[PDB]
Amino acid sequence: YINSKYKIDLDKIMTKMKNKSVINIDDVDDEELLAILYTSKQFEKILKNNEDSKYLENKVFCSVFLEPSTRTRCSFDAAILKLGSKVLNITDMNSTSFYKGETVEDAFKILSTYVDGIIYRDPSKKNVDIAVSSSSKPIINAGNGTGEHPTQSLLDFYTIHNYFPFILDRNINKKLNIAFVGDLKNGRTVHSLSKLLSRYNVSFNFVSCKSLNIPKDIVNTITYNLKKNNFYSDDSIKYFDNLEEGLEDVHIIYMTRIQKNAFILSNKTLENTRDDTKILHPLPRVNEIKVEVDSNPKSVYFTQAENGLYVRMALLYLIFSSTSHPQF
Amino acid sequence: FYINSKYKIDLDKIMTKMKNKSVINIDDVDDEELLAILYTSKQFEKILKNNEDSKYLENKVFCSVFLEPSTRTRCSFDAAILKLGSKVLNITDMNSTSFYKGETVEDAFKILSTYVDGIIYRDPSKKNVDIAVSSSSKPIINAGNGTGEHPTQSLLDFYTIHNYFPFILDRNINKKLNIAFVGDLKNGRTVHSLSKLLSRYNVSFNFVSCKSLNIPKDIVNTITYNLKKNNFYSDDSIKYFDNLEEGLEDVHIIYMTRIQKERFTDVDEYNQYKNAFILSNKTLENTRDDTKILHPLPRVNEIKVEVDSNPKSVYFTQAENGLYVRMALLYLIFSSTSSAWSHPQ
Amino acid sequence: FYINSKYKIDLDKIMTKMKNKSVINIDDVDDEELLAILYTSKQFEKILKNNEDSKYLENKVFCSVFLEPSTRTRCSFDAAILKLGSKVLNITDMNSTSFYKGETVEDAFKILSTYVDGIIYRDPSKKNVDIAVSSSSKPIINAGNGTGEHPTQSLLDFYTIHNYFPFILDRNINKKLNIAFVGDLKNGRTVHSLSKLLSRYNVSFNFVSCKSLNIPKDIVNTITYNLKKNNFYSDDSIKYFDNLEEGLEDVHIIYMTRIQKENAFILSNKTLENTRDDTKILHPLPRVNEIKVEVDSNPKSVYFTQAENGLYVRMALLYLIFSSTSSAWSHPQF
Ligand SMILES: NCc1ccc(Cl)cc1
Ligand SMILES: NCc1ccc(Cl)cc1
Ligand code: NA
């Protein structure tokens, strides 16, 4: 087991990930990220070649979604079913209608006796953490109000690593440059991915209108993670209020929603980007990326959404398997 | 592989052709495709009635998206997927606006088709099913939309008719099927679709309705065109009646429609439309002995509960056949390949 | 071959009889059927606790119809079907009127039973479950209705009790089980059902409640009838208290219920000091204030193990009804 040049003791890394809950991207260390990226890649090649994907039969999951996040739940359902496991769904409720005046702690204590594991999406931060205390079974956070959404960060990173596999090397001479564009204050997907990218030799352009810029505590985390690996310089983090400057010499453009224009991506705005630049967007989009860009080979936001299948399959496999691993 | 012992079906050849086909409209199904669907449906009927292994399509994952309540049809599709041995993730109890939370139909289907092998889609918007078909990298089966397209209802209607009157398939000038369509023929879109499919064959139509609620001109033109193309059109091909006793005379099939009170000016005008076209053992005495009664269901007042005991009634077998026809269609479309030995027998 | 500590079970014979049986009411389950359910539940308990293969009923497709929210009970049934290796399609987030949309219960179940092997049905209407049973060509398991029939709740309550007090099965005059039912005994239908089942055995009942909320007369009569039939009825068979101190004295089981104000009957470590060493605490759940969170630590509490046993009991019942094996060799046997 290799990613061209890093040997993965997938056995050793699984013994450690077995029955781990994944709430925040900080719950995933370097070795765990390598295992997730290696395994995701195998599910990518197995599904693209129409091979048997059933590496985790015999599990029964509960999926609890206490806000509409139909794309994210469908992605998790598809991953569970494609692995050959089974799922029981709780949807089209909110927190108050589901906890009909019963405690979160009682609910998860009981529900964890029925299933092998739980996919949980709830806009309350409090609730996911109470669920983790009370559950006898691993929980995968599918998203909460504090902007923790680890499978989104993991599929974002997997997507970037497919075009720029040198992000993993921590080589001083091989730096990745990313522009984050739009609502960086409220775009929590940016906060999570920034935290993960700063573990590596990465340089950040935060492109926003003053009012909606990256929060100070996220810039502190980036600075801390860059200093720890001796990749911090005065050039590590730049701030722009316009695309022309922001999109210059960046390998990745990561677009977000801007609710309430200067931050609209078009084929025109993409002319003075590198030949190799790739465009991510966690989706859904509104106006932020013009439909014309879909034809531009730099666009990968739809491949990005697709990779979420492979990354969620990988993570379920590595956590819930009771080991013959996926290969080729 | 034969049907009626007349027509040999190259199920391999026909599968290679149907593989990953979307089915939106009954015109997406040709003669050979219909024969393959009828043959395969029949095998699933005999396999399930004899409690044998039904698992002819195991390794597939479907998404079922129903953006209006159509619980019988959704359950029928779920059951077909699950009985074949495949798996399904469901979207129900949403409408168009709550599901497309201001995201484009194009974007939504582009993403969702990366997660699954196939999509079952029901949406009252016709626009939406067509956009879904353009954007989806995977086959779509229309489970029903606003323009009255509902091809699996047409297919199970036809399968049901062909079980009692297998000569509809022969296109023989001397072996004509006579069907009476009864009730709200303006709004009974199930009639429009089945008419279109029956007119491909040697068939004669009684449209039994009252004034306001007759079969639309565009459907009559389609029937006329399809009958002329197979040299089965005469002055007798299409008759119109405003009452049962004339309408039900010398017809092999009676197809009753839903009559929703929602469709009149008041509850008055609705109750005098029921009564006029309500089916009873009395109204059925001067029908042929071989007459069979279909109804797409639900039945409310259109057919009296006493008729359920009448051996002419098949509307419950009809609903049941939807399982076997949806299993057949999924098998033929979503098998990754076919071998001689792998088809239902 | 199949033994229940010391009772030999002809699981083949009992299955040939239970095959395609509907289970609406706890009285649809006789002595032999209860022994089979307890034996089979126990196997699923040991198989799942040891992460062994649980797939003793693959190849089945169920419909689960829940025409009121009862999310815990629906999840429990879904989990049981999926763990057995079968498949289920769901009808939820509907009520009676939105699902029937003025089509008959009889037509709906006639059609739906052509699609599936079996139906799990929860509906507040009692009329509806009975019409569903007439119309369905396939077995129905009642998951709950308004007349308080909920047989899998009675069965998992009983399974839980039998795990700590296996002598309830012996019908031995010298080995009597004493249970206190606490709270809203008028409206706590789970009490009515369990009482009916426990009274088939050598059992003594403390009904602890106020005045407005006492056990109804007709349930006391059923208990008296079932106790008299097995020569276990005395003037001491049924006692009535309005306070915990007296109610909880010398009882092997405390079964708590919801007391919804539309104070006095709250279980704490203090109220549990004058119970037997061996007493176990059940509660069908959910709880509100009836049991203080401190009691969860008290080894006498088993209400969470109780809810867990619902998985193993619902797996057992689905297996025993819907299995189409022949061989004695194919039954669970840990
Ligand atoms: N209805 C928005 C949407 C898009 C994609 C998916 Cl997978 C699900 C829902
Ligand atoms: N009523 C909230 C709840 C739902 C499911 C389960 Cl299993 C437990 C409690
Ligand atoms: Na499902």
Side-chain angles (χ1 to χ4, degrees):
Chain A
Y1 310 102
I2 331 203
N3 329 41
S4 93
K5 60 189 320 197
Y6 305 106
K7 204 121 296 175
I8 298 180
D9 197 335
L10 206 47
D11 264 28
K12 180 154 312 188
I13 296 167
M14 260 181 246
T15 295
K16 171 171 143 208
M17 295 181 79
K18 185 151 186 57
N19 292 322
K20 151 199 208 77
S21 302
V22 178
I23 311 307
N24 129 68
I25 193 54
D26 294 333
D27 295 341
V28 179
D29 74 8
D30 292 350
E31 276 197 342
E32 291 167 339
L33 186 54
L34 288 193
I36 293 166
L37 290 178
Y38 173 82
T39 305
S40 291
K41 176 60 56 182
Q42 306 314 111
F43 289 131
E44 184 186 312
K45 284 186 201 267
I46 291 176
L47 271 58
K48 284 184 198 279
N49 279 99
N50 304 304
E51 282 158 15
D52 192 341
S53 59
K54 291 188 154 186
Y55 282 87
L56 190 80
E57 323 192 54
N58 283 57
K59 302 301 151 164
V60 174
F61 294 96
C62 185
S63 174
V64 188
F65 274 68
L66 298 188
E67 73 182 343
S69 191
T70 292
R71 174 182 316 82
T72 305
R73 69 153 265 249
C74 282
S75 184
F76 273 109
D77 281 357
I80 294 162
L81 294 171
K82 268 306 279 164
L83 281 172
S85 271
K86 287 167 184 293
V87 60
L88 145 216
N89 290 272
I90 296 153
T91 72
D92 276 21
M93 303 185 207
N94 70 6
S95 143
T96 56
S97 85
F98 169 80
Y99 298 113
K100 277 309 338 264
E102 168 178 55
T103 63
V104 177
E105 23 277 283
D106 288 356
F108 268 80
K109 194 153 171 44
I110 294 156
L111 180 62
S112 61
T113 69
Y114 293 170
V115 297
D116 299 311
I118 297 166
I119 283 83
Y120 188 27
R121 167 149 305 200
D122 189 339
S124 162
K125 47 307 100 174
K126 212 170 151 280
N127 284 175
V128 179
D129 292 342
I130 298 161
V132 181
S133 310
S134 311
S135 175
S136 62
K137 298 294 153 58
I139 294 178
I140 304 189
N141 180 200
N144 67 47
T146 64
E148 303 173 303
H149 191 353
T151 57
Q152 187 77 62
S153 308
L154 286 168
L155 78 83
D156 290 352
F157 192 99
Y158 174 88
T159 298
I160 295 177
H161 168 263
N162 276 359
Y163 307 107
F164 300 111
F166 66 74
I167 13 70
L168 280 181
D169 303 340
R170 291 212 254 247
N171 183 335
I172 190 59
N173 304 116
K174 284 182 198 179
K175 179 146 68 61
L176 185 122
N177 299 336
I178 177 166
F180 284 108
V181 181
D183 174 358
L184 307 183
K185 193 196 189 232
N186 298 295
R188 300 288 205 157
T189 178
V190 175
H191 305 175
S192 193
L193 183 50
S194 285
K195 282 207 302 172
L196 179 55
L197 286 174
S198 49
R199 285 150 62 163
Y200 298 97
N201 188 181
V202 176
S203 192
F204 297 83
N205 297 181
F206 295 112
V207 185
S208 71
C209 255
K210 173 74 166 148
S211 335
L212 308 167
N213 195 27
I214 189 74
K216 213 168 183 161
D217 75 317
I218 298 292
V219 168
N220 288 341
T221 305
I222 289 161
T223 307
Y224 174 92
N225 293 334
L226 284 183
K227 289 188 174 223
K228 173 169 50 133
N229 289 135
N230 308 276
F231 301 137
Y232 183 65
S233 69
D234 312 346
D235 207 45
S236 280
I237 298 162
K238 302 187 300 290
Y239 305 94
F240 304 92
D241 78 348
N242 66 279
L243 289 192
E244 180 164 49
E245 283 198 313
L247 270 32
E248 188 179 324
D249 196 40
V250 301
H251 309 275
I252 299 295
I253 299 158
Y254 192 108
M255 301 293 303
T256 64
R257 211 139 46 267
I258 313 98
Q259 280 143 231
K260 279 303 136 298
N261 259 343
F263 300 110
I264 295 170
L265 208 56
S266 68
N267 289 318
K268 190 135 320 188
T269 73
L270 282 169
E271 283 177 7
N272 302 146
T273 76
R274 314 169 37 101
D275 289 347
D276 64 3
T277 100
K278 293 306 201 299
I279 306 154
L280 282 67
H281 188 315
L283 295 174
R285 65 159 155 201
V286 176
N287 305 153
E288 317 90 273
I289 309 186
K290 290 197 151 160
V291 164
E292 62 173 37
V293 172
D294 301 356
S295 309
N296 192 318
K298 293 177 174 166
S299 67
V300 297
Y301 31 91
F302 290 115
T303 303
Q304 185 188 349
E306 175 185 349
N307 290 333
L309 178 60
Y310 315 135
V311 169
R312 297 206 247 249
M313 287 176 82
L315 184 63
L316 293 176
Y317 174 77
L318 292 170
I319 294 183
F320 295 102
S321 194
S322 52
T323 297
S324 185
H325 297 316
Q327 204 184 278
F328 182 90
Chain B
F1 311 106
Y2 296 85
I3 197 176
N4 312 341
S5 303
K6 274 225 198 65
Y7 316 98
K8 50 163 153 165
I9 298 172
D10 198 333
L11 213 43
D12 281 7
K13 226 153 231 204
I14 294 170
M15 259 176 257
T16 296
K17 173 164 150 202
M18 292 182 80
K19 180 179 188 44
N20 293 332
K21 151 200 214 71
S22 299
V23 182
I24 309 309
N25 191 291
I26 192 54
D27 294 333
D28 298 338
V29 179
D30 75 7
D31 287 356
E32 264 181 3
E33 291 168 341
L34 186 54
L35 293 185
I37 293 166
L38 293 175
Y39 176 81
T40 305
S41 290
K42 175 60 56 177
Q43 308 312 111
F44 286 128
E45 184 187 310
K46 286 185 187 314
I47 292 173
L48 270 57
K49 284 182 194 278
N50 284 261
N51 305 309
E52 290 160 21
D53 178 8
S54 58
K55 290 191 152 166
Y56 285 84
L57 185 78
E58 298 197 69
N59 268 37
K60 297 310 154 159
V61 176
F62 296 88
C63 185
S64 176
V65 186
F66 274 63
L67 295 190
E68 76 186 342
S70 186
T71 296
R72 167 194 299 85
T73 304
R74 186 208 108 201
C75 287
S76 184
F77 270 112
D78 282 357
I81 295 160
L82 294 169
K83 270 302 279 165
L84 280 173
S86 273
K87 286 171 188 294
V88 61
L89 55 125
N90 299 266
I91 293 157
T92 318
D93 176 36
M94 305 210 162
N95 67 11
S96 150
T97 59
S98 85
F99 170 80
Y100 299 113
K101 297 183 301 279
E103 165 174 55
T104 64
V105 176
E106 287 86 334
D107 287 358
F109 268 81
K110 197 137 167 44
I111 294 158
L112 176 62
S113 58
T114 70
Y115 293 172
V116 295
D117 298 307
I119 298 155
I120 285 89
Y121 189 27
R122 166 146 308 201
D123 189 337
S125 163
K126 196 219 187 304
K127 313 152 213 283
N128 283 175
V129 176
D130 290 340
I131 298 159
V133 181
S134 305
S135 308
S136 172
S137 61
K138 296 292 154 58
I140 295 181
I141 308 203
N142 181 196
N145 67 47
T147 66
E149 301 172 305
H150 191 349
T152 56
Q153 185 78 57
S154 302
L155 284 168
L156 77 84
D157 289 354
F158 193 98
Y159 172 90
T160 301
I161 294 175
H162 166 262
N163 275 359
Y164 307 105
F165 300 109
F167 65 74
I168 9 71
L169 282 181
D170 305 339
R171 297 200 173 103
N172 180 346
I173 190 58
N174 299 118
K175 300 207 184 161
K176 181 145 66 59
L177 183 122
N178 295 339
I179 177 165
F181 285 110
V182 182
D184 176 354
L185 304 185
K186 188 185 204 292
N187 295 295
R189 308 305 272 283
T190 179
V191 174
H192 305 175
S193 193
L194 180 53
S195 281
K196 213 166 287 190
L197 176 57
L198 287 172
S199 52
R200 271 136 84 159
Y201 298 96
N202 186 8
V203 177
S204 198
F205 298 82
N206 295 181
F207 294 112
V208 187
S209 70
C210 229
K211 276 81 167 223
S212 0
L213 293 187
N214 314 321
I215 188 75
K217 283 179 191 60
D218 77 310
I219 295 293
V220 172
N221 283 357
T222 304
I223 287 167
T224 300
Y225 176 93
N226 295 338
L227 287 182
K228 290 185 173 181
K229 174 181 49 164
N230 290 133
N231 311 277
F232 300 140
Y233 183 67
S234 70
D235 311 352
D236 254 87
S237 278
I238 299 165
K239 295 199 297 287
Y240 305 92
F241 307 92
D242 75 355
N243 65 275
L244 263 48
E245 46 267 54
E246 285 189 329
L248 270 29
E249 200 197 349
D250 195 40
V251 301
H252 309 277
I253 299 294
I254 302 168
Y255 193 110
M256 304 296 299
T257 58
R258 312 181 52 188
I259 296 164
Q260 300 161 238
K261 69 183 254 77
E262 275 78 46
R263 210 45 95 165
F264 301 72
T265 70
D266 41 29
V267 205
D268 282 349
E269 178 204 282
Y270 157 83
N271 284 330
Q272 271 139 328
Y273 197 100
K274 300 235 158 144
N275 304 185
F277 297 104
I278 271 180
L279 207 55
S280 67
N281 290 321
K282 189 156 207 167
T283 73
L284 283 168
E285 276 176 42
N286 284 174
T287 76
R288 313 168 39 99
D289 291 349
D290 65 358
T291 294
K292 299 300 172 176
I293 306 155
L294 282 67
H295 188 316
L297 296 182
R299 162 276 300 277
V300 179
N301 307 148
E302 309 95 16
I303 306 183
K304 289 195 165 199
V305 162
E306 60 174 34
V307 173
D308 301 356
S309 312
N310 193 317
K312 293 178 176 167
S313 71
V314 298
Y315 32 89
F316 292 116
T317 296
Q318 181 188 355
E320 174 187 358
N321 290 333
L323 175 59
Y324 315 137
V325 167
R326 296 206 248 247
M327 287 180 82
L329 185 64
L330 293 187
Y331 168 80
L332 290 172
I333 292 186
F334 297 100
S335 295
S336 47
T337 73
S338 72
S339 230
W341 47 257
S342 76
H343 308 301
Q345 277 222 294
Chain C
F1 191 40
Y2 307 95
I3 328 214
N4 213 316
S5 329
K6 262 187 218 187
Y7 297 123
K8 198 220 178 38
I9 317 305
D10 197 333
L11 201 50
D12 245 19
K13 234 78 145 195
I14 294 165
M15 259 171 231
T16 297
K17 172 166 135 211
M18 293 182 81
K19 182 152 194 55
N20 286 316
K21 154 206 213 65
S22 301
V23 179
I24 310 307
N25 191 288
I26 190 55
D27 299 332
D28 298 337
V29 178
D30 75 6
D31 286 351
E32 277 172 16
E33 290 168 343
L34 185 55
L35 295 191
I37 291 168
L38 291 176
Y39 174 83
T40 303
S41 289
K42 177 57 55 188
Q43 306 314 112
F44 289 133
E45 184 188 308
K46 285 151 157 160
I47 290 177
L48 269 58
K49 285 185 194 279
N50 282 263
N51 308 307
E52 323 257 9
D53 184 349
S54 59
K55 292 202 169 161
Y56 281 85
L57 187 80
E58 331 196 61
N59 303 327
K60 263 61 207 190
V61 181
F62 294 92
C63 188
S64 170
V65 187
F66 274 65
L67 297 188
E68 73 188 344
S70 185
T71 289
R72 172 190 313 81
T73 305
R74 184 206 109 204
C75 285
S76 179
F77 270 111
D78 279 357
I81 292 161
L82 293 170
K83 270 305 283 164
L84 282 171
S86 271
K87 291 167 182 287
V88 57
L89 53 125
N90 293 94
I91 294 151
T92 73
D93 278 23
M94 303 198 183
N95 68 8
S96 150
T97 59
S98 85
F99 170 78
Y100 293 114
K101 281 196 307 277
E103 162 180 60
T104 64
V105 178
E106 22 277 281
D107 287 357
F109 271 79
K110 195 154 176 40
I111 293 156
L112 177 62
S113 59
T114 70
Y115 293 169
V116 297
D117 299 306
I119 300 160
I120 284 91
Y121 189 27
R122 163 141 319 194
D123 190 336
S125 162
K126 199 216 165 345
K127 314 152 191 276
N128 284 178
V129 177
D130 290 339
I131 298 160
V133 176
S134 309
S135 308
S136 173
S137 60
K138 297 294 152 57
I140 294 179
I141 303 182
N142 182 193
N145 67 47
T147 66
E149 302 174 305
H150 196 343
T152 56
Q153 183 81 62
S154 304
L155 283 171
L156 76 84
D157 289 354
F158 192 97
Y159 173 86
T160 298
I161 296 181
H162 169 261
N163 274 359
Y164 308 106
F165 299 111
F167 64 74
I168 195 163
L169 277 191
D170 302 335
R171 291 214 252 252
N172 179 337
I173 191 58
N174 301 137
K175 288 175 194 173
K176 181 152 71 54
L177 185 126
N178 300 335
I179 175 165
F181 286 107
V182 180
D184 176 354
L185 306 184
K186 192 199 148 145
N187 298 125
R189 299 180 152 292
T190 181
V191 177
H192 305 175
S193 193
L194 184 50
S195 286
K196 211 164 291 190
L197 179 54
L198 290 171
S199 49
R200 286 146 66 165
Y201 297 95
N202 187 7
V203 177
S204 192
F205 299 81
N206 296 182
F207 293 112
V208 187
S209 71
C210 58
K211 193 171 318 201
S212 321
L213 302 176
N214 317 139
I215 189 74
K217 292 212 179 54
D218 75 318
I219 300 292
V220 172
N221 289 344
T222 306
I223 288 167
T224 304
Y225 176 92
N226 295 334
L227 284 184
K228 287 188 174 202
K229 176 180 182 206
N230 290 136
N231 258 246
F232 303 136
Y233 184 65
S234 359
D235 307 352
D236 250 84
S237 281
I238 299 159
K239 305 189 293 293
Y240 306 94
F241 308 90
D242 69 3
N243 65 279
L244 269 66
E245 178 170 321
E246 284 192 53
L248 297 182
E249 191 187 78
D250 196 38
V251 302
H252 310 268
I253 299 294
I254 304 165
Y255 191 110
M256 302 293 304
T257 65
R258 308 86 146 206
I259 312 134
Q260 331 187 351
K261 311 317 150 160
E262 100 289 1
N263 56 345
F265 295 107
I266 294 168
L267 207 56
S268 68
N269 291 319
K270 186 165 317 199
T271 72
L272 282 170
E273 281 163 17
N274 272 218
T275 76
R276 316 168 35 98
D277 283 0
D278 63 1
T279 96
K280 296 304 204 299
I281 306 155
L282 281 66
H283 188 315
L285 295 176
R287 64 157 162 200
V288 177
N289 306 152
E290 317 90 272
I291 311 189
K292 289 203 155 187
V293 163
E294 64 173 37
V295 174
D296 302 354
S297 318
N298 188 324
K300 294 174 171 171
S301 67
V302 300
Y303 29 93
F304 288 113
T305 305
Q306 185 188 350
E308 173 189 350
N309 290 331
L311 176 60
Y312 313 137
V313 171
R314 296 207 247 250
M315 290 175 75
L317 187 60
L318 294 172
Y319 172 79
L320 287 172
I321 291 181
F322 296 101
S323 183
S324 68
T325 80
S326 76
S327 208
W329 291 120
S330 76
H331 310 302
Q333 218 189 296
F334 215 60

